Symmetry: D2
Subunit: 159 residues, 4 copies
């Protein structure tokens, strides 16, 4: 088992049988409160896990520092698929990347890997995020160091 | 069935077989997302219902209008009891009242009444709330109209 | 304002300026607990609203009675778009339909209509749902009365 | 920082400056989804943390192994106090102990310790739990090993 709440690099992921293109994971465990009326992880927990991943990822990628001159990040769309049902206390790793970016918005892809006796993808997801100016003047361009990290870490070509 | 999300006065409560001392009720219905892994409303949903109740109630009692000037409401303590399990789709009424008050703080009591062939109290609870000046500078006295409404409407004797 | 938690037919929807193809709505109000750290309805609340809609809709459409010989309904995928941000206490109507069906699965589309000074669509959504046999023997065909309701109420051609 | 989601014994607690009487801790980190509309951990998240804690704790104390045979755990009451606000990403340790017990029921006490430059108790709480036979037929006596563990590990004098 890896440490929880700790960025996992590609090396650690491969050791856990989590394949490319994933380079950044975070591990957590299922909580009782995420279980629905028949004892499965509810469909929105997965989306919450992906949203939790985004916060530190987007700081590590130099998109935002969440401070006063940072862009406000706004979700435009999400999608989530449910490949295998999960239950109480299961350990998992969330992987997320940037798959595509534009001037003032970008797309991420996500997966949830259960660490059982087998490593198994239980869910995939995506999100489209827009950057807005906190002063209401409109869209805010992704910082240049963010564009650079997306290229050098996520391997997204700028073209 | 009374209307939902609408203050229900004492006479409406008595018609629903909800007794004294309750004079202010709000009706809603159990959601699927509130159910725990065995099909019962989870223990925190009750406390959320009591919280929801407090917002319109404290405006009705003249404590706050929730404007930019108004006091900050700070929760210091809650208790909740679980008298009967509730499942999917049950209608209920939340009742609440102020039971004590001093200068800048007060205690409320709550109950949950399941509507149905017979009306049944499924839970009781309490909260202690304090009032602070929004600008950080001190404690905020319960408005005079609040103190009076607590005495006349909630039947509290004095402080 | 319409009544809450009460199926709204096409007539009522049109009166609220909610256009075709919508024929079935349910009204509710935003709760404090659905608000995220900056005071907007969080992205998963919308998905919970759509899931809440499904439960009674699928019974009204004769897909399931949620009993022992009913299919188990399993979500395969969802998508949600966020068109306008929402805040505390806003009244809304959720509309949902079946847009397409197959033998053992179907697709629904959803929208959230805010009832403010203007009626405004704040979000759209979709879901793909599969029917499984509660005894584990695999997929379960959508009942014939369900197929019929989809055609006659949602206006989905079986072709 | 200790490991997360792992029972932390008394010696680990003292090294984190968490005092007697606590001997059993579990660490986690605040999530974005736990934050209320002003950026603070919402009052119910604490109670959820205490609940999460109880599950491994009651297995460690020999009350239940959560098998098909094991007792049903029923919550009758909780209290929670709010001593200091918590924001995004704070690490914490939950401590819990049994404080009293009788024949088929017991009372637990809990605290939340924010980890940081200095360790600070942000909340205290309590729960009353009863044990029922899973087959519906009666009340379930606290196993003898449970009673003994409560006396020796949690320092309870008798019943």
């Amino acid at each position: 088992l890896p440490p929880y709440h700790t960025p996992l690099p590609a090396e650690t992921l491969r050791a856990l049988s989590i394949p490319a293109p994933w380079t950044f994971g975070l591990a957590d465990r299922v909580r009782f409160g995420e279980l629905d009326a028949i004892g499965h992880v509810n469909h929105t927990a997965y989306l919450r896990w992906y949203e939790s991943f985004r916060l530190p990822f987007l700081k590590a990628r130099h998109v935002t520092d969440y401070g006063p001159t940072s862009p406000r990040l706004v979700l435009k769309q999400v999608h989530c698929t449910y490949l295998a049902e999960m239950g109480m206390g299961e350990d998992y790793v969330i992987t997320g990347r940037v798959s595509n970016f534009r001037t003032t918005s970008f797309t991420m892809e996500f997966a949830c890997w259960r660490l059982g006796d087998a490593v198994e993808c239980t869910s995939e997801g995506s999100a489209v995020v827009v950057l807005l100016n906190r002063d209401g003047s409109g869209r805010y361009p992704i910082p240049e160091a963010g564009r650079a990290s997306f290229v050098t870490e996520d391997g997204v070509l700028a073209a």
